[PDB]
Amino acid sequence: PWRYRLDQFTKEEQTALGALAWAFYQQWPAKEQYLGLDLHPQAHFISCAPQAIAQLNDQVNGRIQEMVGILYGYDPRTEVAIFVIGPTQFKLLFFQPIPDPASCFAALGLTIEELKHRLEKTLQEKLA
């Protein structure tokens, strides 16, 4: 049931995820890295270069080209985009939060180390 647990974690942690996205957006202002989420051992966030998500789309012959179009064009100041690696699957954590991710990081007052730790802790427990 890993797919539905990611839908709950997205709408419940709407402010926290926007805070982590805005903190990751300041790490790479030119969007030269994409905030990911790997589930091979435990639920942990990752990052990849744009050429990584592009050569993967070429290797699958355009199977995931829509996801590439979302990661390449989403506005980091108003939208959150996190790709999830699944067993031959990919799921986008794509949502527009209220307030914007700039305000979520400010209204929450949590560093990027504690944002990534709590969110990984919240997702590891939600999967059960």
Binding site: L35, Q55, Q59, E66, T88
Partner: protein
């Protein structure tokens, strides 16, 4: 950001060239086609609103090159956000596991 663009044509050969050019000319996905009768067939894609707008424009232009094809109507609708899924065939397992190794585990810029 996410949207759906639609192109309705009079004729089935015209609607297949449209759907083919829409995915070749943008980063969208062909979500399907629908018939309402009277020779009216509509193809629908989905993706980034700027990709969809680039997808529908190439679709309308490519139909003019079709011998006997005619466009009836076209529109682009903005949709709310949702967590999209992409189930790949088992033949691309070598691509999913190769990409999962090249990624950087640390999101903090060193």
């Amino acid at each position: 950001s996410i949207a759906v663009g639609m192109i309705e044509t009079l004729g089935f050969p015209a609607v297949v060239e449209a759907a083919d050019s829409m995915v070749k000319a943008a980063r969208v996905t062909l979500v399907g086609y629908e018939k309402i009768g009277s020779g009216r067939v509509t193809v629908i894609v989905r993706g980034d609103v700027s990709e969809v707008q680039a997808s529908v424009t190439a679709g309308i232009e490519n139909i003019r090159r079709v011998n006997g094809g005619e466009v009836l109507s076209n529109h682009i609708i903005a949709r709310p956000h949702e967590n999209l899924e992409y189930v790949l065939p088992i033949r691309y397992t070598e691509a999913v596991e190769q990409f999962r190794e090249i990624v950087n585990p640390s999101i903090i810029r060193r």
